[model samples]
Each structure stands twice: as structure tokens, then as C-alpha cells.
Target: ANQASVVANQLIPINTALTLVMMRSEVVTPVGIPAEDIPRLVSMQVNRAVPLGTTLMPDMVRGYAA
Candidate 1:
């Protein structure tokens, strides 16, 4: 049997630079991110701004609100 499995691109570790959609909007936002440090799954608010090299996760962001 072909054991090839598809992976969800949203899955990310702590400190992975991400291009998340602004909460509630189609606007694209660039997130300054750093390398993975803790190597774990985490969530964060998109309204807040992060410094350059600050990594990001899938569940930790949202689109921009109108």
C-alpha cells in the first residue's frame, strides 16, 4: 500500500516566519519571524505586532478586522 500522506501547510512550530491573513480581511500581512526556539505549537493574536525574526504558528493568528 502506498503510505504517502498529505501534510497541512498550516502546521508550524514555535518561531516559524509566517504570512498570515489579517484577521477578518483578505489583506496579506508579512510577519517578521525568527528561527524556531521552543519547537512547539502555540496560538497568538494577530492584532499585535511582532519584531523582526519573531516566529509564528498556524493557530496563533487571525485576519484583520474591518
Candidate 2:
């Protein structure tokens, strides 16, 4: 049993460098991504970019989108 949280979204700026933290939980599983993959993972053309300090959740698929 688990509930997902957004942590943060659409809060980061493009072409900007920063660090983010994704924690592990029942609903949150790292399929191949890791905390180190944050920067490389968040480079999306979409306006909703996961920002630094985002906790991540299973519902937030883009949380790990690359």
C-alpha cells in the first residue's frame, strides 16, 4: 500500500544545471535510473520539468523520464 507524491514538477529551468534527489518507496522503484541520473534524465522539451529536491513517486512517470 502506497500513495504517490509529486515532490516538485515544472519547477526547473531549461539548460540549467542542478541536483535532484529521488527516494525509494513501495510505489517508487528505480527501473534502471538512479539518483545520479537526475540531470541527464530531466532534459525534456516538455514544460513540466522535475526540479531539484523532487522526491518522486510511481504516479509521476516523468520523474524519471529522460
Candidate 3:
């Protein structure tokens, strides 16, 4: 009942910085990725997308990076 987020593939945002990721295997799958990985990935993208917006608070910056 779930989809996968392959490498480099991006999940369109429905709300906030959250997104769906694809995984081919459960080994290195998103869930398998460290809890920190999600935040790291989100932070990197937030900086890129928002750049400079009030909505771009450090907390919203979670799931991207530390």
C-alpha cells in the first residue's frame, strides 16, 4: 500500500517540507535510512526552494538537514 522513492527521485509536497520517498529495497529504504537522513534531505531542499521566506523557519527546515 506504499510507494517507493528511488535515488534522485523527488516526492511532490502536499504540505510543508514533507515528501514521499521511493525505495527499491527495505534494506536501505527510507525507513531504513537513519531518522536523521529525512531531516537532512529536507533542510537542503528548503534552503533551495524557499531561500528567504518567513515560512522557512529552522523548525520547518527539519527533514532536510541539521
Candidate 4:
């Protein structure tokens, strides 16, 4: 566990930078995620062809109060 702990403490995995929604530019706009593509994208992630779409506003995530 020493090596794992060292890496975690040092923040060594710079795989992707984190971002706040308003400050994030690369996120697709709410209207940008095409309706019919959701299933395909989900399939890709599940099949390991794509990684998690772990963004603040995933296409399937609609406004909470809307």
C-alpha cells in the first residue's frame, strides 16, 4: 500500500484535469448531446471503447427542477 499511498498523496495521476461546470468549455452544451446518440455512447463506455462520461452535465442529466 505504500506505493499506492504515495501516488495518491502526490496527485500523480494527471489523467484529466478537473473542472467546474461554468468554467468548463469542453463540455457539450445541454442541446449539443444528440438524442439518439445517448444509447450508443453508453454502449461505448460499457464496452470499454470509451471511459466514463463523468461530466457535471451528462446528456442524460436534465435540469433537476425542470
Candidate 5:
């Protein structure tokens, strides 16, 4: 098993600029919406309990235009 990010949901604070997985740094994963591909999405509240493999989609976060 592997993870793009080491940090879990319980630790990330709200409105954190999600970046730099620093893991294997593989290609665009098809698990969930990836933040790396869409930097324009900018920052959002990391309130939800996000898993390790996937990423933070704009739909799952707030503080951004639709």
C-alpha cells in the first residue's frame, strides 16, 4: 500500500493551502479529484476527513468560486 500524502484528515487545519504530496509523485491518479492538476482552485477549508490516496476537490471544500 501507498499514500500521496502522509498527513491524515485529523491533523490538517481549516483553510490550509494543500500542496506538495512529497510522496512517490506519480501521475494523475484516478481515485478522486486531484489538487495538483488544478492549482487555480487555490485554497480551501481542510475540514473534511480526506483520505491518503485521493485529493481535495473543489466540490469537497469551500472558499472558492464554482
Candidate 6:
């Protein structure tokens, strides 16, 4: 699938610059953070280590309130 996926955990590490979302696609990324919500996380951080093909989620960020 061709979406916003974090192949490397360090791309947006916990204590570093973390990405908000991926693009459009589907390897069946069930719970991936929606493209619309992705924009809200431009300035957020990852809470833990993730895996490849991992669909970025809203809860994955630290300061996420929704």
C-alpha cells in the first residue's frame, strides 16, 4: 500500500521530531490516523516504539486530546 507509514521508528522518534500522518493508501491500514486528522498533529510526538507498515494514529501522539 502507498500511504503515510513509518517503516522506521526513528523517522519520528519518541523524543525527537515525530510525523503527524501518512499519505493515501491501504494495505488494510485499519486504525490508521485519518488523512484529515493528520494535519492536526504537525507538532506532536510519538509515545512509543512502532513497527513497519504501522498506520499512524491520533493517539500515538503525546499532546493529542482527541
Which prediction has the highest lDDT against the true structure?
6
lDDT of 4 at 35: 33
lDDT of 4 by residue, 1-66 (tens): 111100011111122322221121233433333333333332221111212332222322322112
Overall lDDT per candidate, in order of appearance = 0.31, 0.40, 0.33, 0.24, 0.44, 0.53
Report how far residue 5 has shifted in candidate 3, in Å: 13
What would you estimate as the lDDT of candidate 2? 0.40
Candidate 3, residues 4-51, lDDT tens digits: the string is 222323433334444434212222233223433443454243323332
Q: Candidate 3 at residue 45, lDDT?
A: 35
What TM-score number comes out for model 6?
A: 0.53
* Candidate 2 lDDT, 1-66, residue by residue in tens: 254333443365533433343322223323323444445544323234556545543334433444
**Candidate 6: stretches off by over 4 Å:** 1-10, 19-27
Between candidates 3 and 6, the TM-score winner: 6
Q: Residue-wise lDDT of candidate 6 within 3-63, one digit each (tens)?
A: 5432333345555445534223343445466445655666666697555556666567677
How close is each model in CA RMSD to the real structure? 14.2, 7.3, 10.8, 16.2, 6.1, 4.6
| Whole-structure CA lDDT of model 3 | 0.33
Off by over 4 Å in 4: 1-30, 43-66
- TM-score of candidate 2 relative to the true fold: 0.25
Candidate 1 lDDT, tens digit per residue, 1-66? 222211223433434443332111111234212223122212333434544333343434453121
Model 2 regions lying over 4 Å from their true place: 1-33, 45-53, 63-66
Question: How well does each candidate superpose onto the true structure, as a TM-score?
Answer: 0.23, 0.25, 0.21, 0.20, 0.37, 0.53
Per-candidate clashes come to 11, 0, 16, 0, 0, 2
Scored against the true structure, residue 18 in model 3 reaches a CA lDDT of 42
The parts of candidate 3 lying over 4 Å away from their true place are 1-8, 11-16, 22-36, 39-45, 50-65
